[PDB]
Design a protein around this ligand. Structure first.
Ligand SMILES: Cc1ccc(S(=O)(=O)N[C@@H](Cc2ccccc2)C(=O)CO)cc1
Ligand SMILES: *CC(=O)[C@H](Cc1ccccc1)NS(=O)(=O)c1ccc(C)cc1
Length: 220
């Protein structure tokens, strides 16, 4: 695998979005992964509707602003035969009745692939597939105030993740502790959080915060 990957340089990644006060992280992770795979197929980057997932993917097991799983969203796009664009079905940060309209659907998938719970396997998927949906333990003040550098939280759990996000690459930079490797992660808290909405999360530090315990991507 390469030592460094950044799919934003290849056109796979929309700008950072903001989920607001709705527990819809899982929807932003899923649209990020599907936005990348759709671009890989068609060469056109189109922002996808998180509200469409929040309002409509209940039958697959999602619970709107109360939580959900990226895999369930991928299952919805497959079952439903499509997913509306962000512009056609904009984000309201509140759960409402499903307003899906297939005339405005711009994405499809035929399932999803769950990545083995290994950072080595996650690296190979990021290097060969595109942005990857992952879940992390974001439940620490240190994560809220992250600003730069490689994020490392000693109290981070590798088993109880609460926050779905998107791995868009990985890389390295020299650090005091010589733990130099990171995952490049797109968050959904707007661009004022972190590094323009991104975080460099510790890579190859024993599945730090569980980043490799629930990684997946849709099949397009
Ligand atoms: C109290 C609470 C409220 C909402 C959520 S969440 O649904 O927004 N976050 C997801 C993230 C996730 C975790 C593992 C695998 C995929 C996605 C979950 O933890 C799902 O159970 C979690 C906790
Ligand atoms: C992933 C998501 O949408 C979360 C849902 C959540 C998770 C834990 C506790 C309350 C709500 N929303 S979030 O704003 O991304 C977030 C809030 C709090 C924590 C500890 C993590 C993430």
């Amino acid at each position: 695998a390469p030592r460094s990957v950044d799919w934003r340089e290849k056109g796979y990644v929309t700008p950072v979005k903001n989920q607001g006060q709705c527990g819809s992280c899982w929807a932003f992770s899923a649209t990020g992964a599907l936005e990348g795979q759709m671009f890989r197929k068609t060469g056109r980057l189109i922002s996808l509707s998180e509200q469409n997932l929040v309002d409509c993917s209940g039958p697959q097991g999602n619970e709107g602003c109360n939580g959900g799983l990226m895999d369930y969203a991928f299952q919805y796009v497959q079952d439903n035969g499509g997913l509306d664009s962000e512009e056609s079905y904009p984000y309201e940060a509140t759960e409402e009745s499903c307003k899906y309209n297939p005339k405005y659907s711009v994405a499809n998938d035929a399932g999803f692939v769950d990545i083995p719970k290994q950072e080595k396997a996650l690296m190979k998927a990021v290097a060969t597939v595109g942005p990857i949906s992952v879940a992390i333990d974001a439940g620490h003040e240190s994560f809220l105030f992250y600003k730069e550098g490689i994020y490392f939280e000693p109290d981070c759990s590798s088993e109880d993740m609460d926050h779905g996000v998107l791995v868009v690459g990985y890389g390295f930079e020299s650090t005091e502790s010589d733990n130099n490797k990171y995952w490049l992660v797109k968050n959904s808290w707007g661009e004022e959080w972190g590094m323009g909405g991104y975080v460099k999360m510790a890579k190859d530090r024993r599945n730090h915060c569980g980043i490799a315990s629930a990684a997946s991507y849709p099949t397009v």
